[PDB]
């Protein structure tokens, strides 16, 4: 059950300085990358084109190449329209894509954020603001909804292109997505005992401090932190009194270990 995200971020510093960069994720694997610096979108995987032919990719990337230039100009003009109400610096973020379910079921989204606040989404047939959004955005939204061409294209992209494309990606990237890399663990202290776990994919993992059979309820699991090689890092910390570290261990369960859990006795 996977989610495809096209995360775009745009930063307008002056009237005449901006940049827009994009990255694309399928679950937690990056599949595309588009620097302001490059005229073209880059694949970060072998299978990033999906089941699309070369001709369909060209047509699709050209749409984006024109989007980026047009997007930049529009924003710059929309600033001029609202001036002096909102001025630079301006940060703009899109989050666009489609979550995929079994059968044919999908849900496509396109959320826009302004200065870090989610303000606009594309819904059904048009752009609309969301609860909390300023009232001044009604003029921008009225102007963006005036552009019937953009609306039709965006409708096609959300309703058809995204789910078709992602169904393609999932077949082509099957082996990288179903990947099974094993965690490696190690111990340390500072007393707070730390069980480091690293190298594991996919993201679901279980880490507990075990005094033999009994689970130590004080085990504080941290955040999942990324490694560079598209695997994960996690550490669980237990808080103890000194001299009490005998008969204590860290048990780690993961899909790749195949029943054979990692046990580190301290």
């Amino acid at each position: 059950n996977y989610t495809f995200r096209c995360l775009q971020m745009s930063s307008f510093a002056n009237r005449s300085w901006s940049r827009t960069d994009s990255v694309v994720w399928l679950g937690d694997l990056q599949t595309h990358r588009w620097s302001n610096d490059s005229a073209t979108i880059s694949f970060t995987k072998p299978w990033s084109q999906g089941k699309l032919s070369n001709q369909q990719w060209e047509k699709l990337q050209h749409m984006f190449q024109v989007y980026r230039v047009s997007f930049t100009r529009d924003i710059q003009e929309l600033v001029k329209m609202m001036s002096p109400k909102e001025d630079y610096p301006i940060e703009i973020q899109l989050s666009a894509g489609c979550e995929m379910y079994p059968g044919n079921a999908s849900e496509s989204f396109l959320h826009v954020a302004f200065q870090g606040k989610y303000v606009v989404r594309f819904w059904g047939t048009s752009w609309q603001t969301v609860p909390g959004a300023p009232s001044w955005l009604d003029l921008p939204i009225k102007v963006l909804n005036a552009d019937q061409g953009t609306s039709a294209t965006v409708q096609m992209l959300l309703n058809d292109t995204c789910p078709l494309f992602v169904r393609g990606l999932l077949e082509a990237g099957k082996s990288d997505l179903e990947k099974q890399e094993k965690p490696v663990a190690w111990l340390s202290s500072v007393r707070q005992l730390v069980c480091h776990v690293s190298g594991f994919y996919p993201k679901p993992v279980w880490v507990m401090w075990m005094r033999g059979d009994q689970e130590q309820q004080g085990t504080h699991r941290g955040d999942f932190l990324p490694n560079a090689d598209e695997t994960w890092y996690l550490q669980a910390t237990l808080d103890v009194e000194a001299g009490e570290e005998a008969g204590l261990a860290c048990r780690v369960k993961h899909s790749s270990l195949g029943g054979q859990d990692i046990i580190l006795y301290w």
Partner: T-cell receptor, first 113, second 111 residues
């Protein structure tokens, strides 16, 4: 100069047809409009083409647009003396007021009565 | 959706102040000023997105704009030159693409 028209000028006898060319490099190309301008006066819109492959009519004026080609033509059937005028091609790059209009320098028609 | 211009015609001297006015009762937020010159298409000088706004277009040099109200958008030449001899055109429009053009203003700047 992203909007080029052809011929620059042309002379025809009353009753004859003519074809006016507009080729453009503008990106994107939301819509193309054909204006009529009598000498001295101002801009009467004749038609506006919007689709990828579009075809419009307005009496004796008809026109085409192919956006892959970035090419439009205006066909005038059975020229009348009043058609003596400059015919101007305009490409708008948005379907909203955020757009910019890119104007051709026009094709001058003279109809001999 | 009508747009008027005044004056319709003007003879001015080099260095004089000329003001070309454009009025519009459509309640259009947006107004635009072009100039027409033989061998070129219409070219944008200034535009406005509402009262109090004035933006530079493609060839703004020599021209100041002013949008005192929703109704009026003026083009001001402080120190007219002979090169500003042209036929000026004002237009307006709402959020859509269509710009509704005025009848035009001839200007001749003599030495």
């Amino acid at each position: 100069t992203q909007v080029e028209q052809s011929p620059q000028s042309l002379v025809v006898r009353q009753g004859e047809n003519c074809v006016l060319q507009c080729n453009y490099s503008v990106t994107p190309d939301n819509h193309l409009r054909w204006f009529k301008q009598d000498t001295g006066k101002g801009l009467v819109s004749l038609t506006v083409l919007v689709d990828q492959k579009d075809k419009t009519s307005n009496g004796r004026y008809s026109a085409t647009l192919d956006k892959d080609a970035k090419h439009s033509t205006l066909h005038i059937t059975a020229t009348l003396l009043d058609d003596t005028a400059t015919y101007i091609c305009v490409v708008g790059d948005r379907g909203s007021a955020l757009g910019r209009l890119h104007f051709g320098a026009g094709t001058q028609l003279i109809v001999i009565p | 959706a009508a747009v008027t211009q005044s004056p319709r015609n003007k003879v001015a001297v080099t260095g004089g102040k000329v003001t070309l006015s454009c009025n519009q009762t459509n309640n259009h937020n947006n107004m635009y000023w072009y100039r027409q010159d033989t061998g070129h298409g219409l070219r944008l000088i200034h535009y406005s997105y509402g009262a109090g706004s004035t933006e530079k277009g493609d060839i703004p040099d020599g021209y100041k704009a002013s949008r005192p109200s929703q109704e009026n958008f003026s083009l001001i030449l402080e120190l007219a030159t002979p090169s500003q001899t042209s036929v000026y055109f004002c237009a307006s429009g709402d959020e859509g693409y269509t710009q509704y053009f005025g009848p035009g203003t001839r200007l001749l700047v003599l030495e």
